[PDB]
Amino acid sequence: NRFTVAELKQLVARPDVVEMHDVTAQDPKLLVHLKATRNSVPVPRHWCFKRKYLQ
Amino acid sequence: CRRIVPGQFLAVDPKGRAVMISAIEKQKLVYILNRDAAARLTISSPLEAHKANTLVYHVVGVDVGFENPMFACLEMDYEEADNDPTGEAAANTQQTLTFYELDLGLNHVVR
Amino acid sequence: AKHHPDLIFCRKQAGVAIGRLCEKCDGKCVICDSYVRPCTLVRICDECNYGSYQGRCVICGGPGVSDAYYCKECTIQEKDRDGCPKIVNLGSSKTDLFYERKKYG
Amino acid sequence: MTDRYTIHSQLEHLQSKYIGTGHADTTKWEWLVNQHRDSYCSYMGHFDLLNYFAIAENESKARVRFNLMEKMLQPCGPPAD
Amino acid sequence: RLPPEVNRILYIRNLPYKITAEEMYDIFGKYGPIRQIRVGNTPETRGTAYVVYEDIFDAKNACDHLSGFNVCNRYLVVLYYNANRAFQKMDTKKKEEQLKLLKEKYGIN
Amino acid sequence: YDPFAEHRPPKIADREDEYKKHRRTMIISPERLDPFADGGKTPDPKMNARTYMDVMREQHLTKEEREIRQQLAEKAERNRPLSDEELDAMFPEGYKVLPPPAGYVPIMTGFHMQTEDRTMKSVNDQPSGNLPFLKPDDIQYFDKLLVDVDESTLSPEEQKERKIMKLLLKIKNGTPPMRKAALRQITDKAREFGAGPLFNQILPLLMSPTLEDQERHLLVKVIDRILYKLDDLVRPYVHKILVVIEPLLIDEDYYARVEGREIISNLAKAAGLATMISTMRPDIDNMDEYVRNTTARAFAVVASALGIPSLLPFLKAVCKSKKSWQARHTGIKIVQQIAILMGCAILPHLRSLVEIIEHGLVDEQQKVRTISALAIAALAEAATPYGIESFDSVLKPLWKGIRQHRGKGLAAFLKAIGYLIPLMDAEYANYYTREVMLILIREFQSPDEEMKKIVLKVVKQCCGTDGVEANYIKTEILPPFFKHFWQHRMALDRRNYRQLVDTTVELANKVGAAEIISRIVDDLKDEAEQYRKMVMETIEKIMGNLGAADIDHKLEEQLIDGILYAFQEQTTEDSVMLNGFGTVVNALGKRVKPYLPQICGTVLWRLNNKSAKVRQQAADLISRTAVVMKTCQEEKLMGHLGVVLYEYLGEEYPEVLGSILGALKAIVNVIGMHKMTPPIKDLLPRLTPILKNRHEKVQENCIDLVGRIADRGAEYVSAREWMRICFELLELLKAHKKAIRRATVNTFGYIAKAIGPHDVLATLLNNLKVQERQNRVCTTVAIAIVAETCSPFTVLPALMNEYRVPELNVQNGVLKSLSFLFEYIGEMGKDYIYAVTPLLEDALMDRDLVHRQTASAVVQHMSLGVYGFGCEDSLNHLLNYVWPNVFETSPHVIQAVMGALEGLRVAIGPCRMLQYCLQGLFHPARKVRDVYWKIYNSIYIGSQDALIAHYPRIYNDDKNTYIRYELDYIL
Amino acid sequence: MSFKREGDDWSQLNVLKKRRVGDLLASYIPEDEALMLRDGRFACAICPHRPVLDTLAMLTAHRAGKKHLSSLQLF
RNA sequence: CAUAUCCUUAACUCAUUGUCCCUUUUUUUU
Numbered sequence A: 001n002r003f004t005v006a007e008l009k010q011l012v013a014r015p016d017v018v019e020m021h022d023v024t025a026q027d028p029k030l031l032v033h034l035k036a037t038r039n040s041v042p043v044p045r046h047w048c049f050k051r052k053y054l055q
Numbered sequence B: 001c002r003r004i005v006p007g008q009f010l011a012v013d014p015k016g017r018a019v020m021i022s023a024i025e026k027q028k029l030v031y032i033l034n035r036d037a038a039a040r041l042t043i044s045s046p047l048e049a050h051k052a053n054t055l056v057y058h059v060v061g062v063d064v065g066f067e068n069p070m071f072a073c074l075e076m077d078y079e080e081a082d083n084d085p086t087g088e089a090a091a092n093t094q095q096t097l098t099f100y101e102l103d104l105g106l107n108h109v110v111r
Numbered sequence C: 001a002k003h004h005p006d007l008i009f010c011r012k013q014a015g016v017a018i019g020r021l022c023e024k025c026d027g028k029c030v031i032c033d034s035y036v037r038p039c040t041l042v043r044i045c046d047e048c049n050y051g052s053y054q055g056r057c058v059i060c061g062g063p064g065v066s067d068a069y070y071c072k073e074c075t076i077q078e079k080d081r082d083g084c085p086k087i088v089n090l091g092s093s094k095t096d097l098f099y100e101r102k103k104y105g
Numbered sequence D: 001m002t003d004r005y006t007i008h009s010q011l012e013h014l015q016s017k018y019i020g021t022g023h024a025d026t027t028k029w030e031w032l033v034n035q036h037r038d039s040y041c042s043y044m045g046h047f048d049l050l051n052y053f054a055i056a057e058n059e060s061k062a063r064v065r066f067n068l069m070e071k072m073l074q075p076c077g078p079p080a081d
Numbered sequence E: 001r002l003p004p005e006v007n008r009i010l011y012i013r014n015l016p017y018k019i020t021a022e023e024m025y026d027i028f029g030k031y032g033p034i035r036q037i038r039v040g041n042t043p044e045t046r047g048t049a050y051v052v053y054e055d056i057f058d059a060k061n062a063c064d065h066l067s068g069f070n071v072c073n074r075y076l077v078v079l080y081y082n083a084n085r086a087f088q089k090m091d092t093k094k095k096e097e098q099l100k101l102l103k104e105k106y107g108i109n
Numbered sequence F: 001y002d003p004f005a006e007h008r009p010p011k012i013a014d015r016e017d018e019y020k021k022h023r024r025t026m027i028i029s030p031e032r033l034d035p036f037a038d039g040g041k042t043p044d045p046k047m048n049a050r051t052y053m054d055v056m057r058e059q060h061l062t063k064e065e066r067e068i069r070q071q072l073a074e075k076a077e078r079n080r081p082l083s084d085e086e087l088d089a090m091f092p093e094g095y096k097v098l099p100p101p102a103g104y105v106p107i108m109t110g111f112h113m114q115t116e117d118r119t120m121k122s123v124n125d126q127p128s129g130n131l132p133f134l135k136p137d138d139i140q141y142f143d144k145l146l147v148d149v150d151e152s153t154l155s156p157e158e159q160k161e162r163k164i165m166k167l168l169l170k171i172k173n174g175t176p177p178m179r180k181a182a183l184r185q186i187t188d189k190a191r192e193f194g195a196g197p198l199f200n201q202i203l204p205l206l207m208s209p210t211l212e213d214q215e216r217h218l219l220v221k222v223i224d225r226i227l228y229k230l231d232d233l234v235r236p237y238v239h240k241i242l243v244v245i246e247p248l249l250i251d252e253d254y255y256a257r258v259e260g261r262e263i264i265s266n267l268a269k270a271a272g273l274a275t276m277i278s279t280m281r282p283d284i285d286n287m288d289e290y291v292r293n294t295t296a297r298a299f300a301v302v303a304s305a306l307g308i309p310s311l312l313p314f315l316k317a318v319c320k321s322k323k324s325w326q327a328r329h330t331g332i333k334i335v336q337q338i339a340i341l342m343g344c345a346i347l348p349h350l351r352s353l354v355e356i357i358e359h360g361l362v363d364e365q366q367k368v369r370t371i372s373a374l375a376i377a378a379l380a381e382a383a384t385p386y387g388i389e390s391f392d393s394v395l396k397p398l399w400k401g402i403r404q405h406r407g408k409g410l411a412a413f414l415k416a417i418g419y420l421i422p423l424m425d426a427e428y429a430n431y432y433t434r435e436v437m438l439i440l441i442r443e444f445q446s447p448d449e450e451m452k453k454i455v456l457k458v459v460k461q462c463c464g465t466d467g468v469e470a471n472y473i474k475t476e477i478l479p480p481f482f483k484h485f486w487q488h489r490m491a492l493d494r495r496n497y498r499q500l501v502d503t504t505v506e507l508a509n510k511v512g513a514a515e516i517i518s519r520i521v522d523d524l525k526d527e528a529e530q531y532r533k534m535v536m537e538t539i540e541k542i543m544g545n546l547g548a549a550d551i552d553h554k555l556e557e558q559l560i561d562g563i564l565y566a567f568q569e570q571t572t573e574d575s576v577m578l579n580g581f582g583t584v585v586n587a588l589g590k591r592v593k594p595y596l597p598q599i600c601g602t603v604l605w606r607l608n609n610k611s612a613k614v615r616q617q618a619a620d621l622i623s624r625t626a627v628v629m630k631t632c633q634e635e636k637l638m639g640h641l642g643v644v645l646y647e648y649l650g651e652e653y654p655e656v657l658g659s660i661l662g663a664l665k666a667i668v669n670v671i672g673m674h675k676m677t678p679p680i681k682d683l684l685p686r687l688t689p690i691l692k693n694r695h696e697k698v699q700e701n702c703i704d705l706v707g708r709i710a711d712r713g714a715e716y717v718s719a720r721e722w723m724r725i726c727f728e729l730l731e732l733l734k735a736h737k738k739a740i741r742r743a744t745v746n747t748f749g750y751i752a753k754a755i756g757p758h759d760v761l762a763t764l765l766n767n768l769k770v771q772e773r774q775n776r777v778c779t780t781v782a783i784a785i786v787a788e789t790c791s792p793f794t795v796l797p798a799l800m801n802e803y804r805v806p807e808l809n810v811q812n813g814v815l816k817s818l819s820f821l822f823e824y825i826g827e828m829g830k831d832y833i834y835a836v837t838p839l840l841e842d843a844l845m846d847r848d849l850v851h852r853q854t855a856s857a858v859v860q861h862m863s864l865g866v867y868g869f870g871c872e873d874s875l876n877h878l879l880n881y882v883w884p885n886v887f888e889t890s891p892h893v894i895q896a897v898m899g900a901l902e903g904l905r906v907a908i909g910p911c912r913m914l915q916y917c918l919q920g921l922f923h924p925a926r927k928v929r930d931v932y933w934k935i936y937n938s939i940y941i942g943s944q945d946a947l948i949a950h951y952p953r954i955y956n957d958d959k960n961t962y963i964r965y966e967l968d969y970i971l
Numbered sequence G: 001m002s003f004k005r006e007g008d009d010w011s012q013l014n015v016l017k018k019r020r021v022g023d024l025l026a027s028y029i030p031e032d033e034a035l036m037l038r039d040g041r042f043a044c045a046i047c048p049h050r051p052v053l054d055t056l057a058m059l060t061a062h063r064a065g066k067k068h069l070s071s072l073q074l075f
Numbered sequence H: 001c002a003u004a005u006c007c008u009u010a011a012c013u014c015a016u017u018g019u020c021c022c023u024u025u026u027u028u029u030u
């Protein structure tokens, strides 16, 4: 039912931003569209880390 | 210029007893205007008439003689239209004219 | 208040009634609870000054002794536009204090 | 679990009060319909955006406002379910 | 001249295990006739009892004098039982036929 | 008989009368069914859950069975026989009956030496572990904790219920640490436990005959904490909660009454209208009037929560019902209670409500007629001054009843008409007032308590209208009014006291102050204290509203002599004689000047008698009459008083000393510091050891005096004195009363204006090493106070240097005082934002979460100050540090971060804040997503209009169009 | 208050007590074993994951514990 | 997982009087 990373990367206008987990999104097309829009800042990287922030 | 904060439409009662301000959708407010014994203008607290999911195209105050002030409206309800995937409900929903009456006895606005 | 998460504002459409503050609450802001820089006067909704309640404290509910204001920062953020700022429930802290003193005394 | 459900009740409370707040499960369609309708209201409100649109299309302003009010019903097509 | 919490049913703690039915009825039957006795089987309840007296005043007296009695080298702890809940439906059909038979019997209504 | 009876806390069962005891008869019902459960599925047969129709059959069947026993009584309880199969309903399933034996038929000792036994050592009465003391009367609730058992042996249900039993024991009897932890854990694990297992152990505890009200309070706190948790899983338990909470609506304790209301309104919002309506339907026609009373109270609450249009059809159906008048009575009582509770809210429904009640005024049952009149009076009070047109329908039966009925109907009908009179316009009001005045003249005689309570109110209501004449009132109302109502038994009840003083003030408006005050002035010398107190209140309010231009010279001697007598002869230790004295002499003004020798001599004399209360009251009287001596231009006498009160400083009773200080405070205000005798040079070093006094009244009145001298009079003391008095103020920060603490903080700024900010600031910075948070938070505020009053370049360097001290509280402290500082200086803080930007970015990188929450508070307040001033590069830089903290979960830190972002939205704009959120609004994880969505909503609420220009461009997909084509227009 | 001392400042006395407890307990901890952080907290330098503890009383109580002893003998 | 403890946070508070009058075949007498 869901895209793999290769189809998603070709379907973006810009394929450098797509990550492993973006296919797990409920609307992956819009997510990779928003990640490739200008001047938006990315989600803080430690959202997936098990250790707490700055600890 | 918010979507639900009033200010867009403004209608006065032709005798001069109330004024009604409404937003494009779901928010209306009536103010009752009066004169004190020193001939100064006095204002009341707002009476509200709110109706969710409802668009207003125009609002005008109706000239009823000295009865309770009426306000007429070109309303439309988009609630059904956002729940029809086929798109029929957008096509055959229709605009209504609704009259709001300010009941000066009971201090409240009734549709 | 900002110190009590379980308290709840009225938030109805405010009217021409001026909200007041009891001696304990004098000089503080109704929203963010600050002591400095008063910017605008507080208006309360009709139901909240009904009857005997006319003129009680907005924040706690005691006999009001001066007018309540919003501070400058709540004005700039337009927190003064959300509704009637009367607190409508006592909350856990007030109730607990009563039963504790009554147990002792 | 219960925190999920309390977040859910709080956000549907907000959404009833201010039309057009989202929550964690806003679909694309819902977000864009909100910002279309807010745009239309904003265009009606500001006088010079409405002048600009009434000049760029050769229409009168009353016709422009009436067409924008007609578009408020289904601004982005039918709901995607 | 009684407090409202007095009850026909008594709850008994510190009861020595596998005491006989006869010894039980002989201990508690002095104060009055006994409507029913229930003894705890399940091991969490094992060793405690409920005694129902036919008379409320006997139960009052058995609480008043029974407490701290020494049976099998241990003190006996007696209390009133607070019958605060119901465990089954009241079976409206049986109560209906019973009331119909009473009303039929005395021509009431 | 116990000698400890003085010491133990009382029980709820003791203050209850015969009427209240009915709530201990009610037992917990068996299992009830939920119709809405699983989408309203077809009910499973043989479930043995009671439905609605089972409940109504049982109710009808017991009504019939009592009718039977009432019939069979005339021909010829716990005492009643108990059937064998129904008895089984009284016990849990654990036990098996014994068969009676056959031998049972129903109906000194000397010296002995003992054998050693170990068995008495073995038996225990308390549970094992860290569990609280188990009181002996709780044994049958917590008996399963006594026996010891391995957890693995028993079932998951039994370990779940044993777990709940331990938690409830810790909530009832624990110390506040145990109680806090257990409370939290039963809240968090509530849904996992399920609504069933909680309630069948919580509800038996609230039914116990030996609760104290603090234990009842803790238990209902448990119920409303778990009511947020299982919001939809409480439907089978709605009625069970009500019969354990509805008694609290008629509890004599006000806070019990309020918390009963809040938990019924939360229960209504959790269960919804249909569940509530079905559940309470049976209790409307119940045979007991206790159940009907409290159900009528509770429907009012459910109507407050869900709204009147919801249950207005049901309520109309219950008031029309012509099988039972109990149900009609109960429905009209619900309407009365709604009007008492809702107040102003009922107006939009007034004509719906009156039409439900109109048929009750003409009912054949007299109780129903009475409750309809009381309901009309409630509605008309709530609607003042609207709805006269809605009440036109009932003016005719009401009137007909007032002319016709005599007796007990008349009180209720007369009450209703008295409330309808202010609603109506002048032409009809003048009609109805005259005839109802004639009825009230007749009813002044009546020795019936409800009639007296009614006609005082109705006198006031007919006295408001203009259709009564002043001549008529003082000729015909006034002599029987003062003969029948101004009595000693009227003054003892508080409602009668209060109504009486209100009505007499309203009469004085029409008639005149002299005519009322001259009838009651000689009872300022009455020798019943409560009477004098009532008379004092009436005079006080009359001379407060009307002034004293009407009072001639012969009556003012009466009045001055009477208030002096009443002041000297008080015992009850309240402010009524003091307020009365102040109001009267301020009203008299300059006319009181010949009486000031008498007053000063009296007060001066009572300042040294043996009773502490008498001396206290004398100093209070000086503090009230200080202003009168300024208007009477008698500053020499007040100057003398200041000299006298200075010698009373050495008092050892703190109540008297606080009043001496209060009196001094008033004299300093009235005369001024520079003409004060004893001079401020003599007074301030007298006051500095009075600071040590730990009593709150002394501290409060002394700090105000000290702080006021600190600014208006700082040259009366040496700089070393202000320094050591400054040191002393650090002990004033441990006070419990908050006003003492904020007066103390202010005084630090005034002192720093005299000895300079550095000496003050070093002391305050040293105080941050203290452990207790109340000291440190106040020191922090005082650092900001001085920083603001002596401009921030003076105290900045030292405060920023203190951030390097290797102690955690000091570093949190400096950050906290910067937070207050930027809040205080406002726009002037654009001068120091570049100075403190690197300090804050050091704090926002810190490992301690608190360091990050206080730095976010600093960012919020600094952000709003520099709004409009072009400091956006610093703020955007600090956003880069604030923003990764959005995934914190602790609530204090989480709300400080959100406050910082809401401050930044108004300083660097909605566009930047949307640019931060954009990438995570549709992120795959719900964790990142809902945090991101609740930032977006804050931007949306605050700036919904500005975002129109800032949204990104979303492309069209296959069937929906998403481009905003108008903005793409080119001119 | 100069000639004979009056009263006592219990807050500052409690600060002194915290210092004296610190000096006492610190003299039994060798300098490698404990690392003092910027804010005055202490980390255990033996244990590989460097737990950080708020007081020296807690550091001593930690060094008693079994997790520390196991981590100690490897080092 | 299930238990104490230590540290810390929120200018956190220092009791309250605010028709509960509801109830008995019950009703102040020419």
Ligand SMILES: [Zn+2]
Residues within 6 Å of the ligand: C021, C022, C023, C024, C025, C057, C058, C059, C060, C061, C062
């Ligand atoms: Zn207050």
Ligand SMILES: [Zn+2]
Residues within 6 Å of the ligand: C029, C030, C031, C032, C033, C034, C070, C071, C072, C073, C074
């Ligand atoms: Zn504020």
Ligand SMILES: [Zn+2]
Residues within 6 Å of the ligand: C010, C011, C012, C044, C045, C046, C047, C048, C084, C085, C086
């Ligand atoms: Zn309000």
Ligand SMILES: [Zn+2]
Residues within 6 Å of the ligand: G044, G045, G046, G047, G062, G063, G067, G068, G071
């Ligand atoms: Zn270690």
